[PDB]
Ligand SMILES: O=C(O)/C(O)=C/C(=O)C1(Cc2ccc(Cl)cc2)CCN(Cc2ccccc2)CC1
């Protein structure tokens with residue numbers, strides 16, 4: 085799980101919180117903490133360097149350092165990570181959700197915006213959304229091409245801290261109508 089230190093910060097914030105706006109910022113900070121936690125552990129399993137929200141321009145500069153970043157016609161996306169093997173660019177994104185609705189929105193965005201640049205660099209760009217179901221703890225990965233490189237991937241983590249902290253937050257603001265009907 086997260087460091088004792090990070091769990092303490094959430095515990096302190098949840099207990100000090102008197103107001104729905106503060107409460108929702110914790111709710112959102114937990115989802116993001118959980119996403120980043122899966123990110124770090126996933127990157128250990130894949131044995132690739134851990135990254136977050138990498139500017140696409142930097143990814144291009146890394147795999148093709150001759151490219152002038154002032155002129156290249158590149159999309160403005162910040163994918164969580166990426167892998168370049170056998171002249172194939174895998175654009176990786178971490179997801180922690182029980183559904184694919186977010187996965188699809190990200191895949192649709194990243195797929196559409198990377199068709200042009202793939203054609204220009206003559207490098208096939210494979211969009212890999214690596215999602216863990218936080219309940220079942222099962223890995224769902226869309227890209228068949230990516231799953232050939234990494235045929236069996238055990239992460240073996242859990243989100244019981246995240247579930248507890250969230251539950252404590254919904255317990256505390258359970259009769260705050262404004263908290264229960266506020267969005268990210
Ligand atoms: O949902 C994800 O899996 C994910 O990684 C998203 C993000 O990283 C952004 C921040 C974020 C939001 C929510 C979560 Cl759970 C984790 C991170 C939101 C979309 N991003 C929008 C954006 C795109 C391009 C340029 C600026 C901002 C900002 C970062």
Ligand SMILES: [Mn+2]
Nearest residue numbers: 137162163164
């Ligand atoms: Mn991201």
Ligand SMILES: [Mn+2]
Nearest residue numbers: 164177178179
């Ligand atoms: Mn992500």
